[PDB]
């Protein structure tokens, strides 16, 4: 159950979250702060793509007789130019923004992984599949303190060192 | 005791196009293209438009006897023909 | 927004129903699909 392996489907509370395993209990959880930042950011981006557009009262359809052929050709040319520029700009813009959205989400995952790794530098063995297996045994307050960001090294340092010596 | 890092996934099969990729399956997306039409002519800026039934602009403004009843309208946003 | 084929809502910035538009209308495009992703990559577990 790691991020390199795939994506979880049980949790829907946030885009980003932790899975905790304990003797007392086992379940999923979600990082409200990280997800809230990201949801706000994506909302702002979508609003800017749709809102910055401001339409005015324009008439597109024009009528010209047989004598005014140059005017009809000019109107066709300017309409074709506008639609071609709009198509090219919109398609390249949406492709680039999709790539930014995926890149930003991956960067959020890597930032969360590096944060929890910097907090658990050597107290927990790293599986490499996205799982941090604790050497030291600690209950649910320990894991939610890891979620809280208030985990401390010296409290479980000696037990972790003994568990390294055992393995 | 293990702490795992993962991301949310669901049953949605929406396809998005990404530069450097194609047909990427994603959990949610928004559509900027409105290909739908009501299929009925409607008021524009809250003004009922003028209706021309089997009539032209010339027959409406010159006073064709078949087109006489359509002159009684006072305001219009656009003209259907 | 109003087109001869039918009425179009004016919320979204782009449309492809008809090139000839009357009033405050989204800009006409020839693109068949215009979707922006707001989520992550969907992969089964």
């Amino acid at each position: 159950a790691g991020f390199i392996e795939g994506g979880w489907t049980g949790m829907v509370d946030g885009w980003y979250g932790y899975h905790h395993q304990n003797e007392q209990g086992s379940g999923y959880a979600a990082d409200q702060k990280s997800t809230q930042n990201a949801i706000n950011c994506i909302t702002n981006k979508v609003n800017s793509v749709i809102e910055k557009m401001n339409t005015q009262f324009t008439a597109v359809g024009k009528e010209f007789n047989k004598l005014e052929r140059r005017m009809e050709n000019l109107n066709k040319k300017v309409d074709d130019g506008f639609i071609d520029i709009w198509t090219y700009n919109a398609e390249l813009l949406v492709l680039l923004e999709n790539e930014r959205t995926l890149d930003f989400h991956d960067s959020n995952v890597k930032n969360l992984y590096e944060k929890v790794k910097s907090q658990l530098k050597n107290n927990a063995k790293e599986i490499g599949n996205g799982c941090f297996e604790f050497y030291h045994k600690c209950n649910d307050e320990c894991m939610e303190s890891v979620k809280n960001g208030t985990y401390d090294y010296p409290k479980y340092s000696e037990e972790s060192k003994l568990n390294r010596e055992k393995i | 005791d293990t702490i795992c890092i993962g991301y949310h996934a669901n049953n949605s099969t929406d396809t998005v196009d990404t530069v450097c990729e194609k047909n990427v399956t994603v959990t949610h997306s928004v559509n900027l293209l409105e290909d739908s039409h009501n299929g009925k002519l409607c008021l524009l800026k809250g003004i009922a438009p003028l209706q021309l039934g089997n009539c032209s602009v010339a027959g409406w403004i010159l006073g064709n006897p078949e087109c006489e009843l359509l002159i009684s309208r006072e305001s219009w946003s656009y003209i259907v023909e | 927004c109003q087109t001869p084929q039918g009425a179009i809502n004016s919320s979204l910035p782009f449309q492809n129903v008809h090139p000839v538009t009357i009033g405050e209308c989204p800009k006409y495009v020839r693109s068949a699909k215009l979707r922006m992703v707001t989520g992550l990559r969907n992969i089964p577990s």
Partner: antibody, heavy 125, light 107 residues
Framework: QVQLQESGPGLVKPSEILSLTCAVS????????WGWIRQPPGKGLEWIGS????????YLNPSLKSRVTLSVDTSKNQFSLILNSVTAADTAVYYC??????????????????WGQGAVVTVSS | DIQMTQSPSSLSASVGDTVTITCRAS??????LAWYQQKPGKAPNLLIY???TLQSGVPSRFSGSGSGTDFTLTISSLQSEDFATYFC?????????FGPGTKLDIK
């Protein structure tokens, strides 16, 4: 629109198991979290705890963490509250509600829309 | 954790008036807020989510805005059904505490 119906004992002695069962009609335990809200008489609302999915995500209040345990069973289609060591301060009108609102495919946390009509319970002699 | 305050505590207004209720938060909660109105003895209902948007099935007379530590809810025309109490809720972290409540009354 989902319909929420809750059943309660209506009376509870001090210091035993207090259990209420909330049933939902027209909805399932899929992609929507479910939570419990209680109000004391004449005081403001507060959040006891929330379950989401089918037993996957469990959230509890820090003050009531040891006291409340949330259990679900989709086959019978109810979610229930289990409370031990009940006190006189627990006299409240229990509300069960659905976390039905969502933005961009996420279920906003703890923003409730449709609740139940309420089941009153008092702790007394 | 994130302490919630409301102002004014009690307000009275007639039918058709404009009333602004300002719930205030101890620490920045960004744009995340829930507004609930509670009829006496009935289930509270959702009014405003994200402090700027309207939940469907709610009349459009209600409007909310604000950012930072200060937020406002503005009602244009206040009818008889809108005289119930109102609540302010934050949604960024546990515990998800609620506002003390603001009561509305005729004159």
């Amino acid at each position: 629109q989902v319909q929420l119906q809750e059943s309660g004992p209506g009376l509870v002695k001090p210091s035993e198991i207090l259990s209420l069962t909330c049933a939902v009609s027209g909805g399932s335990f899929s992609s929507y979290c479910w939570g419990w809200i209680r109000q004391p008489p004449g005081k403001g609302l507060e959040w006891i705890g929330s379950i989401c999915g089918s037993g996957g995500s469990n959230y509890l209040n820090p003050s009531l963490k040891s006291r409340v345990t949330l259990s679900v069973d989709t086959s019978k289609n109810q979610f229930s509250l289990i409370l031990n060591s009940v006190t006189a301060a627990d006299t409240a009108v229990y509300y069960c509600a659905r976390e039905g609102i969502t933005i961009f495919g996420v279920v906003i946390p703890r923003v409730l829309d449709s609740w139940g009509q309420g089941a009153v319970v008092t702790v007394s002699s | 954790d994130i302490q919630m305050t409301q102002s004014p505590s009690s307000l009275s207004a007639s039918v058709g008036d404009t009333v602004t209720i300002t719930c205030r938060a101890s620490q920045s909660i960004s744009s995340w807020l829930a507004w609930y109105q509670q009829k006496p003895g009935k289930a509270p209902n959702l009014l405003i989510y994200r402090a700027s948007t309207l939940q469907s099935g709610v009349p459009s007379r209600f409007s909310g805005s604000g950012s930072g530590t200060d937020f406002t809810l503005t009602i244009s025309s206040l009818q008889s059904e809108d005289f119930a109490t109102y609540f302010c809720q934050q949604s960024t972290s546990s515990p998800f505490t609620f506002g003390p409540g603001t009561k509305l009354d005729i004159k």
